[PDB]
Amino acid sequence: TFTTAIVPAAGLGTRFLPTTKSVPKELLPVVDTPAIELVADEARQAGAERLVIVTSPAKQSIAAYFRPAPELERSLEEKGKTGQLAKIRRAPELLEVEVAIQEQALGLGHAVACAEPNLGPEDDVVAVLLPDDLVLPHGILERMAKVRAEHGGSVLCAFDIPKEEISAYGVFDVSDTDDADVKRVHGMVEKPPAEQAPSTFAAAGRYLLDRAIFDALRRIEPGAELQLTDAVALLIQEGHPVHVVVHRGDRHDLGNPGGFLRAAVDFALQDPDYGPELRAWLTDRIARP
Amino acid sequence: TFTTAIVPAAGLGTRFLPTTKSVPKELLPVVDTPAIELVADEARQAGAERLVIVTSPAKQSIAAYFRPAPELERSLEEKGKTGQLAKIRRAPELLEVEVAIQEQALGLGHAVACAEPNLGPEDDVVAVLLPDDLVLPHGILERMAKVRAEHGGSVLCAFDIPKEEISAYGVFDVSDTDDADVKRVHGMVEKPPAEQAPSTFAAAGRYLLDRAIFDALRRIEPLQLTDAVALLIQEGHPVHVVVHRGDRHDLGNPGGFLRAAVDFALQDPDYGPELRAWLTDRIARP
Numbered sequence: 001t002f003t004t005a006i007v008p009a010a011g012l013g014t015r016f017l018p019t020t021k022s023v024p025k026e027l028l029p030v031v032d033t034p035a036i037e038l039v040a041d042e043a044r045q046a047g048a049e050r051l052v053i054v055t056s057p058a059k060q061s062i063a064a065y066f067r068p069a070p071e072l073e074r075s076l077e078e079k080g081k082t083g084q085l086a087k088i089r090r091a092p093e094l095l096e097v098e099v100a101i102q103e104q105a106l107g108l109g110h111a112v113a114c115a116e117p118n119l120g121p122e123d124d125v126v127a128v129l130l131p132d133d134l135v136l137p138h139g140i141l142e143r144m145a146k147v148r149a150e151h152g153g154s155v156l157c158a159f160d161i162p163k164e165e166i167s168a169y170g171v172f173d174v175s176d177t178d179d180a181d182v183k184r185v186h187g188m189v190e191k192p193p194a195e196q197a198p199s200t201f202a203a204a205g206r207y208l209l210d211r212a213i214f215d216a217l218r219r220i221e222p223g224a225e226l227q228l229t230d231a232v233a234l235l236i237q238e239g240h241p242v243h244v245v246v247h248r249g250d251r252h253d254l255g256n257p258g259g260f261l262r263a264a265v266d267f268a269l270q271d272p273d274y275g276p277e278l279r280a281w282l283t284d285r286i287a288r289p
Numbered sequence: 290t291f292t293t294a295i296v297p298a299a300g301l302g303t304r305f306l307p308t309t310k311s312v313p314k315e316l317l318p319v320v321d322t323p324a325i326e327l328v329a330d331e332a333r334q335a336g337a338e339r340l341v342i343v344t345s346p347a348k349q350s351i352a353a354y355f356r357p358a359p360e361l362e363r364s365l366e367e368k369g370k371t372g373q374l375a376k377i378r379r380a381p382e383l384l385e386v387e388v389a390i391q392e393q394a395l396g397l398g399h400a401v402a403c404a405e406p407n408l409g410p411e412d413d414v415v416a417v418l419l420p421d422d423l424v425l426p427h428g429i430l431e432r433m434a435k436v437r438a439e440h441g442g443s444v445l446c447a448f449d450i451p452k453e454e455i456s457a458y459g460v461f462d463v464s465d466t467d468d469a470d471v472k473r474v475h476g477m478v479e480k481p482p483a484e485q486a487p488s489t490f491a492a493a494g495r496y497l498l499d500r501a502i503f504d505a506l507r508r509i510e511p512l513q514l515t516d517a518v519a520l521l522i523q524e525g526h527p528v529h530v531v532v533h534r535g536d537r538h539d540l541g542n543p544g545g546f547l548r549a550a551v552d553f554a555l556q557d558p559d560y561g562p563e564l565r566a567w568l569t570d571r572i573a574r575p
């Protein structure tokens with residue numbers, strides 16, 4: 001049912017300095033393809049027709065990536081680079097792309113709130129994809145849509161992480177449903193020590209939010225910032241159904257250079273253009289300092 | 290010695306499409322640091338005072354990378370990110386940076402030619418660094434400068450590559466000098482089969498070019514830099530090569546780029562041990 005997916009992209013990417021002084025984090029390549037394209041594609045495959053990218057005035061450049069490049073397409077076609085030509089055609093052809101300008105990076109809730117002018121009356125629910133999380137294979141938003149179909153309200157996403165490894169995450173307080181991968185959300189605890197974690201279900205950056213989230217974001221106490229978790233807790237307090245889908249597949253974390261490199265190596269090893277030679281090189285390389 | 294280094298950065302990097310549709314190839318990070326900073330640092334360490342980046346109009350944002358970012362700096366200082374603050378201050382403090390515009394990508398020789406208006410009377414010799422080649426450790430240009438001081442003329446750089454591995458490269462035709470790592474260049478053969486390779490010396494992307502190169506570039510038939518060098522040798526200009534014995538990386542395609550990033554990350558304690566452990570498991574399965 002959702003048609004509009006929101007991608008919050010207004011943070012600098014401090015962890016990727018000095019590169020992110022000049023390059024938007026969301027345009028950095030995983031092998032050859034930027035994360036913004038990877039999340040755009042995932043959104044489209046889940047039925048999004050429209051993408052609202054929230055960013056700063058300085059990173060408006062992310063928009064151009066979704067514009068055609070006619071001269072480049074011609075030059076590739078003339079060199080017989082049909083595979084490269086298909087690669088560059090992919091992102092502009094995925095969906096309709098708009099930008100919402102968040103003047104100052106006041107956090108995720110504020111970013112989602114800044115997308116509301118880009119919504120129309122048909123947007124009763126919106127998908128939100130954080131571009132630092134890659135959730136593999138495609139399809140978590142379709143699982144979350146089934147939960148919305150059944151229960152109404154809003155739907156979150158979790159990874160299943162042992163309590164001794166979960167303390168970097170927000171962690172859901174949950175109850176069971178009839179589906180082992182679907183829980184009712186009662187609340188969330190930020191970065192609990194292992195022995196205080198309410199579950200093994202760590203908050204992942206995929207959301208299906210009912211339009212009620214925007215009214216909730218206007219009614220929560222602003223910070224020093226609008227905390228999306230506070231708006232979700234307000235909905236829960238007011239009886240809005242909130243459930244979570246537990247992702248069982250793989251995932252990558254592009255929020256720091258180390259997790260980014262893991263993603264790129266994992267993908268390159270599966271690509272015949274690179275994999276065999278990379279694997280042979282790695283085998284030798286890891287045996288020395 | 291030379292004071293001006295030229296970095297030809299006007300080609301797209303078609304092996305990194307679709308990313309390089311929007312992002313200059315030379316700003317792609319090796320772990321966390323763009324290649325253009327790595328080659329600027331190398332140039333500075335060899336005594337460059339000035340960097341002339343040849344780029345297209347869509348890639349002029351390479352320039353802004355070398356400008357101070359006061360508000361970002363102020364913000365990092367207020368957050369006590371001393372290390373990230375140092376990292377952002379590094380590139381702007383290395384040297385004076387100018388941009389020359391190559392309207393179209395007519396090749397390397399043409400990229401070099403387009404830097405000539407940025408040169409002055411002191412520029413008798415210019416360094417050229419190709420930003421897809423990392424030559425490690427720093428110092429090849431200083432070795433090349435010693436050769437220029439002894440012999441005059443121009444100086445090239447070679448990797449010592451076995452004949453059965455050398456066919457992807459241009460391969461110098463050479464004669465000995467009194468230094469094992471310095472050869473006189475008689476010519477170059479493009480991509481020879483192993484049995485036709487005139488040496489084990491493959492051309493690397495580092496150059497110390499006498500100002501005579503510009504006149505050669507004006508007189509070669511349409512431009513390959515190697516043709517302008519060949520014209521110089523024909524006209525009696527001394528050309529030598531220094532053989533690099535050390536390490537190198539190739540950022541020309543994603544595979545070589547990942548080798549560089551993994552190599553550097555394994556040596557950095559922020560990433561190294563966990564990445565090593567992850568790689569150990571990962572390479573044991575498809």
Ligand SMILES: O=c1ccn([C@@H]2O[C@H](COP(=O)(O)OP(=O)(O)O[C@H]3O[C@H](CO)[C@@H](O)[C@H](O)[C@H]3O)[C@@H](O)[C@H]2O)c(=O)[nH]1
Nearest residue numbers: 297298299300394395396397400419420422459492493494
């Ligand atoms: O019109 C152009 C074309 C290329 N370049 C730049 O020139 C550099 C080198 O171009 P590339 O296509 O990567 O050259 P190669 O095919 O790798 O070959 C060159 O670089 C090798 C070292 O890497 C040498 O062995 C070769 O003799 C030399 O021609 C790159 O940064 C390009 O951006 C420009 O600035 N403008």
Ligand SMILES: [Mg+2]
Nearest residue numbers: 419421422541
């Ligand atoms: Mg090259």
